Structures are given as C-alpha cells and as structure tokens.
Amino acid sequence: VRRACYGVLRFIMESGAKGCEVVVSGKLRGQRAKSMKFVDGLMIHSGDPVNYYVDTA
Amino acid sequence: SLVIPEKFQHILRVLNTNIDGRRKIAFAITAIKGVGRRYAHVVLRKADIDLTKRAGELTEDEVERVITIMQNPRQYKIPDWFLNRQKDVKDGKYSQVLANGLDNKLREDLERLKKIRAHRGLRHFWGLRVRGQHTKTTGRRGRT
Amino acid sequence: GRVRTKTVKKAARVIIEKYYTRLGNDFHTNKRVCEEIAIIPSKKLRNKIAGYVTHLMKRIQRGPVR
Amino acid sequence: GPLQSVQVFGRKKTATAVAHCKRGNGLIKVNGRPLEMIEPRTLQYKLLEPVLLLGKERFAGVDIRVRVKGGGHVAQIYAIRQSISKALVAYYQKYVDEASKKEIKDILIQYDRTLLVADPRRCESKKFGGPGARARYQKSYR
Amino acid sequence: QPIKLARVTKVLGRTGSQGQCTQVRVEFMDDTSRSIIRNVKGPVREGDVLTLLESEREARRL
Amino acid sequence: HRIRITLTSRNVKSLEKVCADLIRGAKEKNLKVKGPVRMPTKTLRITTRKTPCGEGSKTWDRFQMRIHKRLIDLHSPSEIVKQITSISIEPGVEVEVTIA
Amino acid sequence: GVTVKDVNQQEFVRALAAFLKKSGKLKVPEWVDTVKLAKHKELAPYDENWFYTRAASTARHLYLRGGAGVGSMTKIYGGRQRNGVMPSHFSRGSKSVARRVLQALEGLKMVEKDQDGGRKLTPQGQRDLDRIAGQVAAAKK
Amino acid sequence: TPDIKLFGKWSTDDVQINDISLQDYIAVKEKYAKYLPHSAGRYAAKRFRKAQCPIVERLTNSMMMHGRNNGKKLMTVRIVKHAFEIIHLLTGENPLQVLVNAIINSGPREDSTRIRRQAVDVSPLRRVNQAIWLLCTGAREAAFRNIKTIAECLADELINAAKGSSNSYAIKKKDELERVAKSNR
Amino acid sequence: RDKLNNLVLFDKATYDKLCKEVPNYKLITPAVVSERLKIRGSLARAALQELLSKGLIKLVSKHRAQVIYTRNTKG
RNA sequence: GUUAAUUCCGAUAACGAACGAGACUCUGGCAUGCUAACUAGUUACGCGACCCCGGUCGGCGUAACUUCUUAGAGGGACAAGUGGCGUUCAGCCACCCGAGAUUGAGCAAUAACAGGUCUGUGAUGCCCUUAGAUGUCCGGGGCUGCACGCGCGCUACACUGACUGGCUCAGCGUGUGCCUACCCUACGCCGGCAGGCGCGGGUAACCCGUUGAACCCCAUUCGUGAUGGGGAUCGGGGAUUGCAAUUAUUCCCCAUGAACGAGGAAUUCCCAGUAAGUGCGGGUCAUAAGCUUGCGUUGAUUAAGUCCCUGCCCUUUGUACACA
Ligand SMILES: [Mg+2]
Ligand SMILES: [Mg+2]
Ligand SMILES: [Mg+2]
Ligand SMILES: [Mg+2]
Ligand SMILES: [Mg+2]
Ligand SMILES: [Mg+2]
Ligand SMILES: [Mg+2]
Ligand SMILES: [Mg+2]
Ligand SMILES: [Mg+2]
Ligand SMILES: [Mg+2]
Ligand SMILES: [Mg+2]
Ligand SMILES: [Mg+2]
C-alpha cells in the first residue's frame, strides 16, 4: 500500500498540480481497521471553489 | 315585556326528565337524553316557536305538540337521516329514542352482541376499546 | 463584528505603498483605481480593500504608519 | 391635452400598491371603492393620514386610482398608505414646483418615515430540526 | 426622609452574579458638587434622571 | 411564418449565450424577432435525511434543480428556421420548434 | 352616480335581502329550515330567513366577479372545519345550497348561465343591485 | 395639518407629566402622537429606540399575551380604544393624562436583587416597562373568569393606578417591591 | 364556594330600580348593570336596548363585543 | 486589547507562510437607469352593460410602454462621513445622509469514537441454511394486544372566548408516471352530507387559479354554569378507495357527553418580521398527516450583559497512564 500510494502521489505531482490528498481506509496492516493519509501542497475543503478546483473520487 | 310573567315553570319534567326553564328553549330541550342542540332546533323550527323566548315564557299547550313531534318525527316532515336509530335491527323502522328507550336500545344491541359472541360484544364485556384504539398508553384511568 | 482580515489589510498596505500617488481620501475614486490596478474577483472584497485603503491614506496624510 | 400620468409602487411585507395619478378633482379611491370603507375599517386613519397631514388642497388637483395585490390586510393597507404619499410626491416632483415636493416630504418624514421608504423586512426561512426559523423542538434528556 | 432626583454623569460597568445590574456614577440635580455611586437595575444611559429614596447608602464598587 | 422556438436549459450562462447567438443570427439575416422573454425558473426541491439509517441528529439536505425556459418569436420561412436552428447550438439546451 | 362599490357592503347585503323579502318570487327550497350550510358548521343558521341573505350575497359576489359556478361558491363560503382534537383545515361549503341559490337567481331574470361555464349576472339584476345601492346611499345620507 | 389627535376624540396636548425623570421616556407630546396605536414597528432593532415608541403603542403591544391573544393587534387596539372611552366617561378628563398618571404611580422606584437581597434603584426605562407590564397583568387577572369585560377591566385598572388608592394590582405589587427593597438595604 | 344567582327576567322591584337609578350612572354598560343588579348579562343587554328604545339613554359607540351607553346630560 | 473567530492590532527570537474561519455560492431587499415580453401586465382609445358630464367592470377588442409581473448583465455598503472611547493602533458606541449600518442557508477538519447502518444495494470478508429451505410464492395472524412508567406532539381548561351570518386579503409548490396497473380540476345535474353521473382545460406564467385559506375585521346568541368551553368513550345509519376493512382505512349525519378551574418536583426553545397564533403545499398515498420538510398572514414583552448554574475550549500544574 505504501509503495502504491507514494507512486500515485509522485505521478500526480509530476503531472502538474497544486495539491494532492489520498486516503486508504480498511483492514490493511492487521485485522483492526486503519486509515492511511498522504497529503501535500495546498488543499481547499470549503466553499464552491471545491466544485471546480478539486476533484474527488 | 322583560318582566317575568306569572305561572312561570322553573322546572318542567318532560319525558320523566327534569328541565331547567331559566335557559333558552333550544338548549333546555338538550337536557333530555337522545336529543341535542341540532335536533332541538329543528323541532323548535317545525313548531311555530320564536327562538328568543325562554322555556318558562311559553305556555303548555304547545309543549305537548313539541313532545309529540319529538316522539313522532317522521309525521311532521323530518327525514330519516335526522334520527339516531335509523333502520333499527329489530323492527326495521326509522325512529327517535329520547332518554327512556335510548339506554334500553343500547343494552339491547349490547345484549345482541353478547348473545352472538361477536368481537364488539367481547370488547364491551371486557371493558376494552371497541374502535381499535391503542390501550397501551390510554384508558389507564378507567381500568384502575 | 466588522474586522478586516489579513488578506484585506496586507493587500491594502502593499497597494498603497505601490500606488501612493494615485490614492486619496475619496473612497469611490480609489475604489475604481484599485479595480483597474489589482485583479480582485469579488466586488465585496474590493470594497473592503478600498475602505481600508482610505483609512490608511488618512493615517498616512496625518502622520507616520508602521 | 398633456397627460400627467404618474405611476408609483409602494411595497410592504409582501403586498404592493400601484397608485396612478392624473388630472382631475379631489377623488381618491382604491380597487374602485372609496377609502372611507376599507375593511378592516378600524385602521381607517392609517389610510386617511396622508390626506390629513397634507390637506385636501393638495389632493384637490390630482385624482389617484391604485391597484393592490399580494400580502395580508395590514400589509395592503400599509402598502397603499406608502403608495399614496409616494405617488403624490412623484407627481409634484415631475409636474409642479419642487418646493411643494420638498415641504410635503419634510412633513411626511418628520411625522413617520414609513410613508416614503418601504420596510425591507421579510419573513425568515424555516430550518430543519425545529418548528420555526429560530425555534427548535423540545430537547429530550434521558 | 425626602425622595430625591439625581442625574447620571458616568457609568462604571456591569455588576452582580449574572451581571444583572450596572453600577453607575450619579450626581444630584441641586448640589452637583456631591456625586455618589449606586447600582441600577435595567438598561441605563448617560444623562438621565433617577429617583432615589435613599441618597446616603453607597453601592459597592468593583 | 410566425415561428416560435423554445429553449430549456439548466445553466444560465449557456442558455443566455444560445439566445444571444440566435438573436444575433436573426439580426444578421435582418428578420423581425420578438425580444427574449424569460419564463419563471422552475426549482425542483427535494429534502432528504442525510443519514441512511435513522440514528443521529435529524439533519436534512436541500437538493434543488433549476430549469430556465426562454422562447423566441420570429417571422421567417420554415427553411430559414431550420437553417438557423441547425447551427450554433449548445448540447445542454433542449430545443422545441412550434409553427403555431 | 352611485354604484355598489360606492357604498358599504355590510348593510348593502341586508338591504338586498330586504328587497328579496318584499319581492317574494324566489321559490325557496323546502328544506331551508332543516339544512346545515356546510360540513364545517355545527348548528343551523341563527337567522331563519338566511336564504334571502345568502342569495343577496351570492348576487353581490357574482356581480363583482362573474363566471363563478357551484364549486367557486363553495370555495367562497368555505371555512374552518374543527375536527375536534385534530387541528382545523379549510373545507368548502355545501354544494346543494349554493346550487339552489343559483337556480333561484336563475328563475328570476337577474343571473344567466353564460358561455364558457359559470354564472353571469344579467343587466336587469345589475339595475336592481345598484339601485338598491343607491337607496342605501340615500338612506345613509 | 395641525391638531394631531387620537382615534377620534382626544388630543395629544393638555397632558401633564409630574415626574421629570420620564420626560425622554414618555412619548405622548407633540412628536409621537398617532391617530392609531398601530405602527410598522422597528423599535426592537437597537437598544434605546424602545423609549421613542409611543406609550400607547407599548401598552397595546403588551396587552396581548397568554397564548390565545398572541399576534392579535387589531383586537387590542379596539380594547384600548374602549378603555379610553370608559375612563373619559368616568373621570371626565384626558384619557392619555390618566394613563400617564397611572404609569408614573405604578412604576416602582426601588427593587431588590442578588449581588439575601440588596436594594437597587431602577432605571427610568426599566420602571416604565415594569409598570406598563404589571398593570396589564393586573387587568388581565381581574378580567379572567369574570362577567366584566377586559375593555373596562383595563380602564378601571388605569384610574385606580392613577388615583393610587391601593386597590390596583399594579399599585399593590409596586408597594410590595418597595417594601422588600426598603427592608433589604 | 361562591355562586351568583342572576335573575333571568325582571322582578317588579328590579324593574323599578332599573328605571330609577340606572339612567343616573356616569357609565352604562351591560357588564356593570349585571354586576350591580344580580341579573344575566343577556338580560342586561335586553334591558339596555329596551331603555334605548324608550330613548332615555345615550350611546357613544357600538361594537359586537361591548356596547357602551352614556347618561343624559343635565343641560 | 479587540473581534462571531489563532479575526486583527500590539510587545516579542522570530520572519515569512498554508488549511480553517474569513473569503465564496445560493437566497430577500432597491434600480421609473439597460434588455426584453398575446403562456404577464400597465396606461390610453373604441364598443357593451349599469347608476344620478362623471363612476364601475378579472365585460369585449386595439395605440404606446415595462411602473406593477417574470428573468439576465451590471450597479449598489465599505465602518464610507461626523462626534466620542480607545497606545491614537486594532476595534467599539451614537448619529446625518442612506433599500439596507449584524438577512438566512450550503460547503464546512490536522484528528478521534471500536457511536449507527451487514435490514439501501449486483459494495463486501467469515460463519450459517440451501429442498421437510433462514431462497421464492400463496392464505391468515401480528407489528395497534394493556394492571404500569417514560418521551416527542394535538386538543383544550374559556368573555381578548364559543356559536351563527356578512365583508375581506398570499406565497411557497404539485399535477396523465419505463416496468407502473395509480394525475390536478373548472362547469352542469342528484342529494343535507361525504359522494355519484356527463361532456371540457392542463405535460403547464396557457387549466384548476386573480390559488376568493385561515387568523383577523363587522353584526346578533350565550352570561361565570364544568355553561352553547371541551370532544374522550360509545350506538345507529349513510358514502369513497381497494381482490379484500373484522381489531371498526378514511369521510358524513343523529345521538351518548368523560377528565381538564392555568397544573408540584423538575425542565424545553428563543432574541426582529423572532417567538407565538393561524392556515396552505411536498415526502409517505389504492385509501391518508394528530409527523416532518417549506411557505404565507397577524405579529409583540424582555434584553446589546455575565460566568452565578450547566457545559465546553485555552493556559498552568501533577502523573508510576501511552493498546493512553
Ligand atoms: Mg476499513
Ligand atoms: Mg477492522
Ligand atoms: Mg479558505
Ligand atoms: Mg370514534
Ligand atoms: Mg371540502
Ligand atoms: Mg467558511
Ligand atoms: Mg456481484
Ligand atoms: Mg418465497
Ligand atoms: Mg370539559
Ligand atoms: Mg361509540
Ligand atoms: Mg430539560
Ligand atoms: Mg501528585
């Protein structure tokens, strides 16, 4: 998971962007649930700019 | 005319039921069981009685007419719908019951339900609500 | 509560220090001046900047400012 | 000859009153009926007050017919109360000397400002989790 | 004991457990040299007349 | 002859652009055209609970969809109408043509 | 010089009811005294000659806004229906009473069943209505 | 036109305000006179614009309480008008003057608070508001479950408060509060 | 505890005192008439309108809820 | 110090920043200035009807315009100005001019919960059933059962009221469905009534509908009586929907006529078109709101403050806890 998340993070950054965030939540690294978060750059969580400046999947 | 005349009947016993005569006629009649405000107004309109008069203001020559109309409504141009025992189970005739046969017919219908052992009769026998109300949070006052 | 934020105050300060000649005590004049000079997408923010610009211009013309 | 037709709209909570002024005698009526009988008749002075303050001399030279739509009874009567004054001010400002316009505006404003400027108060939206705009349902501890 | 009228000249601030009162500097309208302090219930302004039944007892200052 | 074209769209900017383009095309062809009227906006409002289940504080959403309808009247042969309407159309605007 | 709208309606309806009373050519229904005006009412009307007043009001409403049928009259005369424990809701009036009033006013030459539905008030009824209004204005002043 | 008056009978002038501490808080003279006690409002926006509201309007607003009367201004204006008619017939003098006399008499001059109790003098605005609310409460209490109509249960309360014969509920509560404040000082 | 036994119709003495003292009151309202004569409110209203028909009582205003009557002037 | 804000000023081993807040989007305000309108109107013109030249018409047609109506680009308010407090900084109060000198909502975060949803699913690991089925279909019952306690709500306890007639004003919306079998209603007849029978309008600023809603306003009846308040319980009858109502789906009429005299301990929500009163749309719908989500009408008292109570955040301190 760590290799995949860093790989997609680097690909997005080298593609050209102002901020990236990925969350992987599940039963990885043990049966107990855990969530891993990889963030960098500027991120916007509020306002209508989130409708046309950040895309979520 | 406002002065109270003589022979003022303060209490009139009509159909073995006392009626207070110091109130309006249309609502003094309501003291009799089996007749309400709507029924009394219709009866007092079929009779040539002005509404503003009191139960002690008028004479006894017309009260006999009124009671006969009350006990025989269909004969004085009153339709069947305005009766409380329309299409009676036993005799099958529309009629009005007033404070004497009202309870007798009530227990007659209940006794019929008791005899046939119907669901409504069982609810009446047990003192439980017959119209399907929720007794979980209601009716606690009557049943202890 | 009517408090200008860091964005309004900082932008007003740099605008004044860059165009001190074109600014004065008239709110409406410098409102159009800052509209032509700086690209403020929101007109409400533009009015906030112009209002603080005028207040700072009064402070400058009266005395020093840090 | 000249058509001195003046349109004016006065607004209340939701009601609006469009008063039309032209040349004529001192006849004032709304919806085709005179002011003296407008239910609720209790607030009759709230409609005659623009006439009372300025005098029948000013209204003698102008006849006003107004159309009222929207709002409630109190909203409509306040709407026509505002619109009658606004229509007269507009007529005077546009066809006669403005000194009369200035003096009637000063008298109306010094009496009550609602004669000219409409109140921008509107009903507030209701929100979920409560019966009204600010009110909330009863909290249930335990 | 006479009932006296005093004119408010300065407001000290809120007072009370819930801040339900306002201690206010007040002066009498006959000998304006003499001025005292007193707690006043309800909204107050500067430059209004208050009816004081007792002009001697002094409210605590904070 | 008295053709009437109805445009319904969800985006105000696109609909105004389409109507402006059509009237400009009418101006270029020098045709008598009625002004662009605006029907009142239709706001389909739906309120639902945020929570899939029933627990939690009672929080409600407000999902509204706005539809704008504008119609234009022109006096031209039907061939001209088809020629004008066949070009310069935004995909997000539904088009209706009425002869009467 | 004076029309209905130039005079108060509150006594105008009573004056027209008096006009119908002295006319006496309306052919009132037989069940007038034993009818409830709406499902949302409790008792019979206090006024025993209420039919003349109702006819007067119906004519007044028809003059002000013509083309109103039975359903429109029921909506006009509807009101709160206090269901007891449940809060009240608006309910239309009885259809029969309004329909009989229209037929009674149709028998006399005062209203007319016009085209495109509804009831239209005839000029003869218009003349009677506003001359009653003229009498009201004369009596008041 | 001059001569601004009440509904149809009484003029704003010929009113005497004995207490000079309520000059700016009683609005009846030459600047706030209205033919009706009904106005658009806007007096609850800021803090001290409440005083500028005419005292008859404040009385009319405060009359309607206890749920069933809420949001019924067209009713209380008639109630106040009838009360003005009764007091005019009874006393034979200015109804607004007797209203002012009732308010200045019913208004408490001292009260108790928690800072046991400590005596504090009330603000002139607070005194006016308390009097205009107590007298309505007393009149409503008298009218409740009684044949006598509130259209005079407010009026007789007015004259009783104006006379100060210790019969009005507002006067009785005023003296009770003064007595409590006097003891706790 | 306390109940009022109001008179539905006039006695001879009550009618006489109504004709004597009621017209001399500063205010005349059915509420005060019932209060000080121990009669029904409806009886008070009927008596007041009958006395109005006689023409011995003046009125100032008329309303559905309360109607207020005033006495004759001494002039 | 100040602010709704780690929002700013200001001292300062810190300077520059970023997320959040703020900003922003939607919503209401007002613009006789712009664009426009027979699916909206206004003003005038001509007929038609009526009353003593004039007045009314949502009666009929047409010469101008968009003030009223609808919806688009912009404008507009920013603590802008004055007087005061405030290091004279941030900011606060009052006021003139002014549509406004605090409109409301949405998104809303480094993080946590072993809070709820495996009954939202063709999202899902494991376990279990899998033909005498825990799969599916059919008939019926139940989810409402009532000695009791608790919570969210409706009705009311009445004269500011109830009842009976008259007058009179809105905006939120929806309305013929893919399977789907079920729409919103004008008008004329029958009847008191729900409701039934016929031709019409509407896929909608076009028809219901100028949404003739209530409250409230006007005029009589009631007279302090658990009374014409109150409508619980209950009988008889009459209709609608559904394959089917019995445990009465719902609606209507007559009649029977319970408690409740303003409610203890305790406790809920709120500050301006607010609460409260009142009625109307949508969700559920074959039948349906005593819930909720919104809208409209009337429309106030208090108050521009605090940590007293209750919580909750920051700082200081203590720790043998750190799956805390
Ligand atoms: Mg997981
Ligand atoms: Mg896990
Ligand atoms: Mg941000
Ligand atoms: Mg039942
Ligand atoms: Mg109905
Ligand atoms: Mg934000
Ligand atoms: Mg699958
Ligand atoms: Mg199966
Ligand atoms: Mg009861
Ligand atoms: Mg039963
Ligand atoms: Mg609690
Ligand atoms: Mg220790």
> HEC profile for E6-57?
EEEEEEEEEECCCCCEEEEEEEECCCCCCEEEEEEECCCCCCCEEEECCCCC
D20 by DSSP, 3-state: which? strand
Q: How far is CA D56 from CA D34, D41, G95, I3, in A?
A: 15, 21, 49, 58
Exposure of D13 in the CB half-sphere (CA atoms within 13 A):
13
Q: What six digits make up the tokens of I56?
A: 């011995």
- Give the dihedral sign, CA A39/A44/A45/A50: negative
Cα dihedral F9/F10/F14/F16 (nearest 10): 60
Resolution of the experimental model, in Å, one decimal: 3.1
Q: How far from F74 is each of F19, G89, H10, H149, CA to CA, in Å?
A: 13, 49, 67, 71
Task: Please state, in angstroms and rounded to a whole number, the distance separating the CA atoms of residues H15 and H96.
Answer: 7
As to burial, measured by CB atoms within 10 angstroms (0-12 exposed, 13-18 middle, 19+ buried), residue F44 is exposed
Give the span between the Cα atoms of H142 and H137, in whole angstroms.
9
The phi and psi torsions of G106 (rounded to 5 degrees) equal -80, -35
D10 CA distance to ligand 8 centroid (A)? 68
Q: Does G33 touch chain D (CB under 8 A)?
A: no
Domains contained in chain I, CATH given: 1-75 (1.10.10.10)
Find the DSSP H helices in A1-57.
2-15, 49-52
H72: which residues sit within 8 A by CB, 6+ positions away? H64
Contact of C15 with C22, CB cutoff 8 Å: no
Q: Which residue, among F55, F9, F3, has the nearest Cα to F32 in the 3D structure? A: F3
Backbone CA torsion sign across H168, H169, H170, H173: positive
Given an 8 Å threshold on Cβ–Cβ distance, is H42 in contact with D119?
yes
The strand pair at A19-26 and A34-41 is best described as: antiparallel
Is C51 buried (19+), middle (13-18) or exposed (0-12) by CB count in 10 A? middle
> Closest residue to J115 by CA to C1' distance?
F56
User: Quick count: other Cβ atoms within 10 Å of Cβ C57?
Assistant: 20
Q: What separation in angstroms does the CA of B109 have from each of B113, B119, B123, F5?
A: 6, 13, 13, 72
CA G44 to chain centre: 17
Q: Answer yes or no: are the C-beta atoms of D103 and D36 closer than 8 Å.
A: no
**With contact defined as beta carbons under 8 Å apart, do F22 and D93 qualify?**
no
Q: Does H82 touch chain D (CB under 8 A)?
A: no
CA distance linking residue H144 with residue E49, whole number of Å: 37
Q: How far apart are CA B25 and CA B8, in angstroms?
A: 14
For residues E7 and H20, give the distance between their C-alpha atoms in angstroms, rounded to a whole number.
11
For residue B123, give both structure tokens.
């609810």
**CATH superfamily, with its number, for domain H6-183:** Ribosomal protein S7/S5 (1.10.455.10)
Which run of H or of E encompasses D62? strand D62-69
One-character DSSP codes across H46-60: SSTTTTTS-HHHHHH
Q: Give phi and psi for H176, each to the nearest 5.
A: -60, -45
Q: What does the alpha-carbon distance between residue H172 and residue G33 come to, in Å, rounded to a whole number?
A: 56
The overall longest dimension of chain G from CA atoms, in Å, is: 53
Contacts of I6 (CB under 8 A, 6+ apart): I34, I38, I39, I40, I43
Centre of ligand 2 to C-alpha C26, Å, is 65
Tokens standing for residue H29: 């003279």
Find the Å distance, CA of residue B24 to C1' of nucleotide J228: 10
Q: Which of G39, G43, G47, G96 is the best substitution to test chain B (most B C-beta atoms within 10 A)?
A: G43
Q: Are strands E49-52 and E4-15 parallel, antiparallel or unpaired?
A: antiparallel
How far is residue F60's CA from residue H125's CA, in Å, rounded to a whole number? 44
Three-class DSSP category at H118: strand
Residue D16, burial from CB neighbour count under 10 angstroms (0-12, 13-18, 19+) = buried
The span from the CA of I18 to the CA of I16, in Å, is: 5
3-state secondary structure of A19: strand
Q: Is the CB of D136 under 7 A from strand J?
A: yes
Domain positions in chain H are 6-183
Helix, strand or coil for residue B120?
A: helix
**How far apart are the C-alpha atoms of F15 and F70, rounded to whole Å?**
8
What is the Å distance from ligand 2's center to G135 Cα?
91
Q: Distance between CA F91 and CA F88 in Å, rounded?
A: 10
SS3 of G96-139: HHHHHHHHHHHHCCCEECCCCCCCEECHHHHHHHHHHHHHHHHH
CB contact under 8 A, H149 and I63: no
**Out of H82, H89, H148, whose CB is closest to I35?**
H148
Q: Which helix (H) or strand (E) holds F66?
A: strand F63-75
Give the separation between CA G30 and CA D42, rounded to whole angstroms: 40
State which amino acid sits at residue F69. K
What is the distance between the alpha carbons of residues H124 and C13, in angstroms, rounded to a whole number? 48
Asked if D119 and H40 count as a contact pair (C-beta separation under 8 A), the reply is yes
D128 touching chain F per CB within 8 A = yes
J125: residue with closest CA to C1'? A27
Q: Is the peptide bond before D40 cis (omega within 30 degrees of 0)?
A: yes
Is residue H130 within 8 A of residue H107, CB to CB? The reply is yes
Of D73, D141, D86, the residue nearest D115 (C-alpha): D86
- Residue G79 corresponds to which tokens in the numbers above? 């009101």
With CA atoms as reference, the chain B residue closest to I51 would be B2
Q: How far is CA H40 from CA D115, H44, H57, in A?
A: 11, 11, 11
CA distances from H62 to H13, H24, H56, H71, H76 (A): 24, 20, 10, 11, 9
3-state class (DSSP) for residue B103: helix
| Burial annotation H6-28 (CB, 10 A radius, 16+ → b, else e) | bbeebebeebebebebbebbbbb
Q: Is the CB of H114 under 7 A from strand J?
A: no
Residues F1 and F75 sit within 8 Å (Cβ to Cβ): yes
Touch between chain D and chain F: 3 or more Cβ pairs under 8 Å: yes
Tokens of C27: 């709110």
Tokens of G115: 């085209």
Residue-by-residue DSSP string for G24-80: --S---TTSTT--S-TT--S--SSTTHHHHHHHHHHHHHHHS----HHHHHHHH-EE
Helix (H) or strand (E) holding F96: strand F93-98
> Over the Cα atoms of chain B, what is R_g?
19
DSSP state of D71: S
The experimental method behind these coordinates is: cryo-EM
**DSSP assignment of C40-64:** -S-HHHHHHHHHHHHHHHHHHHHS-
Residues in chain A: 57
Copy the structure tokens of residue D112: 């009550």
Q: What angle do CA A48, A51, A54 make, to 5 degrees?
A: 115
At least 3 CB pairs under 8 A between chains H and D:
yes
CA-nearest of H8, F16, D32, G109 to F7 is F16
3-state secondary structure at position E60: coil
Statement: the CB of G117 is under 7 Å from strand J: yes
Torsion sign over Cα G50, G56, G62, G65: negative
Helix (H, G, I), strand (E, B) or coil at D39: coil
Q: Which residues contact E62 (CB under 8 A, 6 or more apart)?
A: E12, E13, E15, E23
**Residue pointed to by tokens 């052919």:** G27
Candidates H105, H112, H88; CA nearest to H163 is: H105
Q: How far does the centroid of ligand 6 lie from the alpha carbon of residue D60, in Å? A: 58
Look at chain F and count its residues: 100
Which ligand does the CA of A47 lie closest to?
6
The helix or strand, by DSSP H or E, that contains position D80, with its residue range, turns out to be helix D73-95
Which residue, chain included where needed, has tokens 């009033």?
G101
DSSP H38: -
Instruction: Name the residue among G118, B82, B2, A25 with its Cα closest to residue I40.
Output: B2
- Quickly tell me which residue has 């005062």 as its tokens: G110
Which residues pair with residue F45 across a beta bridge? Answer: F64
Cβ–Cβ of I26/H89 closer than 8 Å? Answer: yes
Cβ D110 to strand J below 7 Å: no
- CB of H134 within 8 A of CB of H160? no
Instruction: Return d(Cα G115, Cα G66) in angstroms, integer.
Output: 12
Task: List CB contacts of H79: < 8 A, sequence separation 6 or more.
Answer: H63, H150, H151, H154
Any B CB within 8 A of G6 CB = no
Structure tokens at C41: 């997408």
Q: How far apart are CA F88 and CA F79, in angstroms?
A: 16
> Which two structure tokens, joined as six digits, stand for B56?
């002690």
Q: Is the CB of A27 under 7 A from strand J?
A: no
- D41 interfacial to chain H (CB closer than 8 Å): no
Are G44 and G36 in contact by the 8 Å Cβ rule? The answer is yes
* Cβ count near G98 (within 10 Å): 25
The Cα A19–Cα A43 span in angstroms is 5
Instruction: Please calculate the CA angle I58-I60-I65 and round it to the nearest 5 degrees.
Output: 110
CB pairs under 8 A between E and H: 75
The answer to whether D128 CB sits below 7 Å from nucleic acid chain J is yes
User: Which is nearest to H74 in space by CA: D77, D32, D116, D50?
Assistant: D77
**For residues E21 and H113, is the Cβ–Cβ distance under 8 A?**
yes
Interatomic separation, CA of residue H82 and C1' of nucleotide J274, rounded (Å):
30
Strands F93-98 and F63-75: unpaired
* Count of CB atoms situated within 10 Å of the CB of B87: 11
C-alpha A6 – ligand 3 centre gap (Å): 27
Pairing mode of beta strands D28-30, E4-15:
unpaired
Which residues are CB-neighbours of A56 under 8 A, at least 6 positions away?
A: none
